[PDB]
Amino acid sequence: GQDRFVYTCNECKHHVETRWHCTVCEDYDLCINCYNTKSHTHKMVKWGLGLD
Numbered sequence: 001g002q003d004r005f006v007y008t009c010n011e012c013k014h015h016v017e018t019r020w021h022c023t024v025c026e027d028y029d030l031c032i033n034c035y036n037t038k039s040h041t042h043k044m045v046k047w048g049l050g051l052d
């Protein structure tokens with residue numbers, strides 16, 4: 001999910017201002033903490049606006 005400065009963590013299914021985003025999955029996302037632990041190993045991108 002995305003907005004011009006908002007995003008989601010598809011692991012929290014809550015909003016984030018900075019996400020890791022799977023370009024494999026259908027616009028799947030992870031906040032920093034989830035990316036750091038949930039070990040999503042796929043071809044991603046990152047969009048960030050506050051806590052990169």
Ligand SMILES: [Zn+2]
Binds near residue numbers: 022024
């Ligand atoms: Zn993925």
Ligand SMILES: [Zn+2]
Binds near residue numbers: 030034
């Ligand atoms: Zn998360």
